[PDB]
Amino acid sequence: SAFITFEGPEGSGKTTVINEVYHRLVKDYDVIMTREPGGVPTGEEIRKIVLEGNDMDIRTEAMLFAASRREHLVLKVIPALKEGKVVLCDRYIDSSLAYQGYARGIGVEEVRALNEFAINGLYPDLTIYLNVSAEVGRERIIKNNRLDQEDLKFHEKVIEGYQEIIQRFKSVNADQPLENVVEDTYQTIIKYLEK
Amino acid sequence: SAFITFEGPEGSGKTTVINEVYHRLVKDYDVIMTREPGGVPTGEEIRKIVLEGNDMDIRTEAMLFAASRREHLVLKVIPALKEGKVVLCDRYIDSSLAYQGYARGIGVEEVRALNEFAINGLYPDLTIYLNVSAEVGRERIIKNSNRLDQEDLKFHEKVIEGYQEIIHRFKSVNADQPLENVVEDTYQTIIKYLEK
Numbered sequence: 597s598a599f600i601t602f603e604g605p606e607g608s609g610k611t612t613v614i615n616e617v618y619h620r621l622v623k624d625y626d627v628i629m630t631r632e633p634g635g636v637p638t639g640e641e642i643r644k645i646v647l648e649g650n651d652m653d654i655r656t657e658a659m660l661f662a663a664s665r666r667e668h669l670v671l672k673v674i675p676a677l678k679e680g681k682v683v684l685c686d687r688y689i690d691s692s693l694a695y696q697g698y699a700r701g702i703g704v705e706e707v708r709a710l711n712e713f714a715i716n717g718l719y720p721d722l723t724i725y726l727n728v729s730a731e732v733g734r735e736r737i738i739k740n741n742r743l744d745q746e747d748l749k750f751h752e753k754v755i756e757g758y759q760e761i762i763q764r765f766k767s768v769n770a771d772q773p774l775e776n777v778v779e780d781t782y783q784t785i786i787k788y789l790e791k
Numbered sequence: 792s793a794f795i796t797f798e799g800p801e802g803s804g805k806t807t808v809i810n811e812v813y814h815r816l817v818k819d820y821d822v823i824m825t826r827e828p829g830g831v832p833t834g835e836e837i838r839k840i841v842l843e844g845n846d847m848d849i850r851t852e853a854m855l856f857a858a859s860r861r862e863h864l865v866l867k868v869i870p871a872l873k874e875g876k877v878v879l880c881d882r883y884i885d886s887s888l889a890y891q892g893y894a895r896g897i898g899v900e901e902v903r904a905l906n907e908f909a910i911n912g913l914y915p916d917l918t919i920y921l922n923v924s925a926e927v928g929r930e931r932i933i934k935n936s937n938r939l940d941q942e943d944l945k946f947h948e949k950v951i952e953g954y955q956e957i958i959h960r961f962k963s964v965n966a967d968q969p970l971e972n973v974v975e976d977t978y979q980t981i982i983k984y985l986e987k
């Protein structure tokens with residue numbers, strides 16, 4: 597089996613990339629794709645508390661998402677890995693680190709500690725990082741008007757966080773057209789699976 | 792202000808003690824007594840998921856206790872302390888350490904890290920540990936319920952073992968005494984702290 601996660605800042609083309617790569621991999625491997633909380637009832641119920649929050653404390657939000665993450669891991673991801681499947685996951689611990697730990701300023705070490713408690717040693721075997729520049733990412737988001745200056749700065753912080761976070765990681769140049777980003781990611785995964 | 796928590800295994804007389812101490816302190820202090828989630832809506836919703844759980848993973852449970860703990864802390868305890876009140880809290884971080892960490896086996900250090908994230912440095916000013924022996928505790932449990940099965944007896948013993956390690960801020964009160972004495976000792980311990 598293999599636990600592969602996909603990471604990247606806003607405008608990295610990640611959604612398009614993971615779905616196209618998944619569709620291509622299903623043809624040659626016993627693989628599934630999921631995105632937290634992956635439809636896991638308890639995971640959705642915990643997440644609902646955050647979605648209905650009003651000025652909810654950011655640490656409370658982080659712990660609830662961490663709890664939801666573990667439900668998804670123990671009820672969906674782990675059983676699938678035990679069945680010998682390759683599991684592709686759209687975002688995981690690195691997203692929490694880059695967004696909550698770095699960008700939101702909770703603290704990298706604090707959020708890392710929270711992440712570790714939630715995953716209990718289950719790290720990705722491979723993590724694809726869709727490395728997009730702030731400028732291209734911005735345009736892609738706009739492509740999909742203009743963006744607020746506050747958002748632009750947060751966008752930059754998220755990217756800065758991923759840079760610091762990044763053997764587990766394999767970066768793909770996400771500044772290229774999506775077609776190429778897909779091909780590069782697919783090839784990176786095949787190389788890993790065939791090693 | 793003063794943030795005073797109460798800790799102890801089952802059968803330690805904790806409910807009776809906090810209530811009686813509260814009624815004595817309120818004459819002279821601007822005090823409140825609370826428990827997590829303590830009426831805080833989000834804390835209530837979080838706690839509800841744990842109660843309705845079916846063989847819930849212990850780490851998920853720990854994180855929910857921690858999330859509820861923070862909502863109660865930020866939305867109820869801190870505002871009270873800011874008003875300069877004495878806050879009596881029935882269970883706090885040490886309960887997670889003893890139950891989730893030690894007794895359930897997640898690990899005290901791991902659960903401590905999780906809870907330090909949750910309380911962000913806000914530790915109790917004073918923590919009353921109602922030190923009851925496994926045997927006296929058992930009898931009180933049977934009362935408030937006969938006989939207890941081995942599984943529950945062992946768990947109770949393990950929780951006590953965990954607390955012993957944790958307290959090895961803390962003020963121990965001998966909870967093997969009649970409740971009247973446990974209450975008096977606890978009250979005197981608190982007054983000594985409040986007047987210093």
Ligand SMILES: Cc1cn([C@H]2C[C@H](O)[C@@H](COP(=O)(O)O)O2)c(=O)[nH]c1=O
Pocket residue numbers: 654657658659661692696
């Ligand atoms: C704060 C937080 C948000 N999220 C998600 C849910 C939201 O769709 C998105 C943006 O949330 P935010 O506006 O609170 O930063 O990120 C997590 O997955 N984990 C977290 O800890």
Ligand SMILES: Cc1cn([C@H]2C[C@H](O)[C@@H](COP(=O)(O)O)O2)c(=O)[nH]c1=O
Pocket residue numbers: 606610611632686687688691692693695696
């Ligand atoms: C999974 C995850 C997402 N997020 C955020 C960042 C993304 O903007 C959003 C999900 O967007 P996405 O569906 O395009 O990946 O939620 C966090 O802040 N923390 C997390 O742990």
Ligand SMILES: Cc1cn([C@H]2C[C@H](O)[C@@H](COP(=O)(O)O)O2)c(=O)[nH]c1=O
Pocket residue numbers: 801805827856882883884886887888890891
């Ligand atoms: C506050 C807290 C309580 N508990 C449990 C242990 C107790 O049996 C129960 C509360 O019971 P009590 O109201 O009689 O003290 O909840 C935990 O396991 N972890 C915690 O962090």
Ligand SMILES: [Cl-]
Pocket residue numbers: 727767768769770
């Ligand atoms: Cl790159």
Ligand SMILES: [Cl-]
Pocket residue numbers: 772773774775
């Ligand atoms: Cl394109």
Ligand SMILES: [Cl-]
Pocket residue numbers: 824825826828829830
């Ligand atoms: Cl209450």
Ligand SMILES: [Cl-]
Pocket residue numbers: 922963964965966
């Ligand atoms: Cl004692």
Ligand SMILES: [Cl-]
Pocket residue numbers: 968969970971
């Ligand atoms: Cl008595």
